[PDB]
Design a protein around this ligand. Sequence first.
Ligand SMILES: [Cl-]
Ligand SMILES: [Cl-]
Ligand SMILES: [Cl-]
Ligand SMILES: [Cl-]
Ligand SMILES: [Cl-]
Ligand SMILES: [Cl-]
Ligand SMILES: [Cl-]
Ligand SMILES: [Cl-]
Ligand SMILES: [Cl-]
Length: 249
Amino acid sequence: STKCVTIPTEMAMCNDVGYSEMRLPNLMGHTNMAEVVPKSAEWQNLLQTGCHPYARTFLCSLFAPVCLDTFIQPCRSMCVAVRDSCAPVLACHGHSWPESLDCDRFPAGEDMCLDTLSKSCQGCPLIEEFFSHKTVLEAFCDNNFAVKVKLAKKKSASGLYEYETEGPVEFIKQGLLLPYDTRTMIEQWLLINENCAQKLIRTRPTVYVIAGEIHHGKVKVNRIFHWQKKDSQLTLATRRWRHHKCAAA
Ligand SMILES: [Cl-]
Ligand SMILES: [Cl-]
Ligand SMILES: [Cl-]
Ligand SMILES: [Cl-]
Ligand SMILES: [Cl-]
Ligand SMILES: [Cl-]
Ligand SMILES: [Cl-]
Ligand SMILES: [Cl-]
Ligand SMILES: [Cl-]
């Protein structure tokens, strides 16, 4: 029916939250630790960002409720705070706030609940057209990656529009990742920023030089340079990048 188990060291989410014994089944419905531990480990990437100081203990009140006490849910206030602070980070990871954590399921008003002690990647930069290769090189130095990509619009079976890279991607500045991983992050950014991709399709030709940052599986495009058919400045900047000395080391 129900039992109490020791929080294992392998459960990094709740191995240092003030108590060592949890009750099963937990508030998430998990009936055994072979289910509790991996499902809790799915939150590790979000929790390592520090999106909200109460995210970890809020989650542990659900995944590892206190053994000897009756089940007390966290307050809807704390759910709304943690959700409003951490949901954009999950969106940057490509995820969304789970329906199982819909804050409307948590108590408010008279119902007793555990409360608090007290009371980014979505940017779409402009398409730069008349620019200097010195500005392009400055963007290269200021960003993690810089690539030459051709974008293409495509109609799916359901009638919706998909935006994809077409042909090979010419890498100018690789950054600290392999070109395969960088390109995978660029595709992820294209899917997450559908409005920005749609904006980029409207400028012909659809060839761009994009520069941005990649941090812990999050991709942010900072600069977008349009590659004209008779381009000179992007050509000069890309040919110069190999021998270019940045202003900062
Ligand atoms: Cl969001
Ligand atoms: Cl973020
Ligand atoms: Cl970011
Ligand atoms: Cl624009
Ligand atoms: Cl920049
Ligand atoms: Cl189309
Ligand atoms: Cl870098
Ligand atoms: Cl054209
Ligand atoms: Cl043109």
